[PDB]
Structure formats: structure tokens, C-alpha cells
């Protein structure tokens, strides 16, 4: 064809049951992870002379919700530049026309692992608090851009062996806040719940609230933390409220019982203090009613976290988001495909 000459910019490699077709600069692809949206490889970028990560997203325009999330991810990864948010190095599609376009490849800095194996390590307070600080800095930065995540979880947070941390994406069941799973309103501190779930899991090993489904998720939460107040119940839609109220009246456990000293270090007065501080922060993050839950700014000032505080990191000015791109405007699926294709072709280096 007329555009067929473009194909020579790329080559293909089989990765499991998928073909990766990438720019020739990216060499020796190897799988490093998988999620729902994409398959991720490590590669050597011969132009930058460094290793990178490459995520393949197929058919990001499959419906309006998927398309909005994908477009927002491209826009935000481009305009955001913060040490605790994964950076965009390149984006491309190997297909040569709008009609043939299906796959988007996002090239990022290569981190070493996701937070999953860290959670199972024996972490001291120094490493736990620094990881949590970094997560809070990244979340604060997103919130300052008008971006509330709602879906933070260990698989979308990555680390390096120097204990640095970056969040992989920009959001929208074990880690989702009550207000998300129950379809209520939400505000910024929706993301504090998820931080609390991850912190709690670092200490307890097991997922705190391992619901087998939606209602089971709620049951795990109230069994541990107690049935919420009538003030909370009145904020529920009528059908949801009937469910939520139609079960046993759990009182919950104290945070001393949920997170006893035996799960923390006890070799010193310093560590005794830090166990108490960690438990105190957990008691302020793992709060069902968001109106009584700590904010991100308050968490960053909490003594457990604040030892790491640096305003150049926590108060970095927000990105300039380009006009309308992060709108609430709606579009047909064909229009969404066109918008994403245009963004991909514009963004490529």
C-alpha cells in the first residue's frame, strides 16, 4: 500500500500467546508481568542505551469506559513528571492506519518488582514508612491535578531495590474503599483507604479484606472494623442500604487486637513507640466512614510518615493538563478510537 513503508520500522516477537510488534530500537523482550489490560515486557532500548518496560494494550477503545481510562492514562502519564509516578518514555502503534489500529505500546522506566513480594517481606519501620510516604506523595500529586485514583493496589505500585516507589496508573476488589464498593459519593481520601489496606497487609501478611465477591467484601470489612453508624447508612442508596443493614451486627476489633505487638519489632523503646504510631495511623486510615477518615495531608504529617517529609516531593506543583483532553465530555466508540489514535500518533517520540 501507500503507507506499507512504515511497517519496516517494527519487528515482531512471540511472548507467550501474544505477538509483540515493536520499534526496532527495543531488543530482547522478556515478560515481566501481566494485568487485565496489558502484557508487560522488559526490553533493552538501543537508542537510550537502557532497559525499559513495554506494556501492550489491545483495543483500548472496546467501549466508552475502557476508552476513557486509556486516553486519560496516555494524557496523564505524558503531562505528569513526579518521582513517585511512572514516567512515559515513548508510545507507538505498529498499525499503519486508523482502520487497522488496535494495539498501543507504552514504554516506561523499568522498575524491579511490584509491591506484592515486598508485602510478604519482613519490613522494618524505616522501609515501611518510606514506602508509605512515597505512595502518599504520588497520591497527593495526583489529587493536586484533580485526579482521584480509587483503585490503588499492590500490583499497580512498583519498586526498586533502593526502596524507591512509583505508582503505575491513574485509576478508574480487596483494596477499594467502602464508598467505591457501595456506590456512594467519594472524595480524595478514598485513596487513603487503599493505603491503609496495603499498610495493614504489610504487617499482617494476609489480605485484610479478602472478599470472594462484593457483599462478601463488605462482610470482611465490618467483621474486622465493626458495623458503621446510622449516619453512614443514610448515605446509601435504598437497595444497597437494605443489604448492608440485613446482616449481623459486628462490633469489630480494637486496633490493638487487629495489629498486636507480636506482628511488629520489640527490641527497643523506639520500636515500641513505632508500633504504637503505626497502629495509630492505621486506626485513622481504616475508617469506613470517609467523613471521619484522615486526609492525605494529615497522613503526611502523622509522626509515622513525617520523618521522611520533604515539600519538594510532597508539594510539587501540579502538572499543566492540556485543555479539554481530561474533560467529562462523551463520545461515540468510533470517536474514542479516533481520539486515542491521534494521541498515540502525536505522542510518539
Amino acid at each position: 500500500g501507500s503507507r506499507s513503508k512504515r511497517d519496516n520500522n517494527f519487528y515482531s516477537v512471540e511472548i507467550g500467546d501474544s505477538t509483540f510488534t515493536v520499534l526496532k530500537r527495543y531488543q530482547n523482550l522478556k515478560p515481566i508481568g501481566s494485568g487485565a489490560q496489558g502484557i508487560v515486557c522488559a526490553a533493552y532500548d538501543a537508542i537510550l542505551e537502557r532497559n525499559v518496560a513495554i506494556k501492550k494494550l489491545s483495543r483500548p477503545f472496546q467501549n466508552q469506559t475502557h476508552a476513557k481510562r486509556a486516553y486519560r492514562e496516555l494524557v496523564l502519564m505524558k503531562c505528569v513528571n513526579h518521582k513517585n509516578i511512572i514516567g512515559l518514555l515513548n508510545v507507538f502503534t505498529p498499525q499503519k492506519s486508523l482502520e487497522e489500529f488496535q494495539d498501543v505500546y507504552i514504554v516506561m522506566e523499568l522498575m524491579d518488582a511490584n509491591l506484592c513480594q515486598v508485602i510478604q517481606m519482613e519490613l522494618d519501620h524505616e522501609r515501611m514508612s518510606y514506602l508509605l510516604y512515597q505512595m502518599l506523595c504520588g497520591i497527593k500529586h495526583l489529587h493536586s491535578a484533580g485526579i482521584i485514583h480509587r483503585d490503588l493496589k499492590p500490583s499497580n505500585i512498583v519498586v526498586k531495590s533502593d526502596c524507591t516507589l512509583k505508582i503505575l496508573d491513574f485509576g478508574l476488589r480487596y483494596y477499594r474503599a467502602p464508598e467505591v464498593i457501595l456506590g456512594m459519593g467519594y472524595k480524595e481520601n478514598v485513596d487513603i483507604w487503599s493505603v491503609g489496606c496495603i499498610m495493614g497487609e504489610m504487617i499482617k501478611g494476609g489480605v485484610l479484606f479478602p472478599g470472594t465477591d462484593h457483599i462478601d467484601q463488605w462482610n470482611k470489612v465490618i467483621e474486622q472494623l465493626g458495623t458503621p453508624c446510622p449516619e453512614f447508612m443514610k448515605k446509601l442508596q435504598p437497595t444497597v442500604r437494605t443489604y448492608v443493614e440485613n446482616r449481623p451486627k459486628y462490633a469489630g476489633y480494637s486496633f490493638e487486637k487487629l495489629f498486636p505487638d507480636v506482628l511488629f519489632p520489640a527490641d527497643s523503646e523506639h520500636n515500641k513507640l513505632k508500633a504504637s504510631q503505626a497502629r495509630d495511623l492505621l486506626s485513622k486510615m481504616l475508617v469506613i466512614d470517609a467523613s471521619k477518615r484522615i486526609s492525605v495531608d494529615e497522613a503526611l504529617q502523622h509522626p509515622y510518615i513525617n520523618v521522611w517529609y520533604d515539600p519538594s516531593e510532597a508539594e510539587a506543583p501540579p502538572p499543566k493538563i492540556p485543555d479539554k483532553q481530561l474533560d467529562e465530555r462523551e463520545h461515540t466508540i468510533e470517536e474514542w478510537k479516533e481520539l486515542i489514535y491521534k494521541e498515540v500518533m502525536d505522542l510518539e517520540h
Binding site: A113, Q117, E126, R127, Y130, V159, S161, D162, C163
Partner: peptide, 12 residues
């Protein structure tokens, strides 16, 4: 009381 450059995660 480590400096940040002394925090190490033994990832595998």
C-alpha cells in the same frame, strides 16, 4: 537510623 540510600529491598 539509616539515610535513604541505605534502605534496601532484597527483591527476587
Amino acid at each position: 537510623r539509616p539515610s535513604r540510600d541505605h534502605l534496601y529491598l532484597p527483591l527476587e
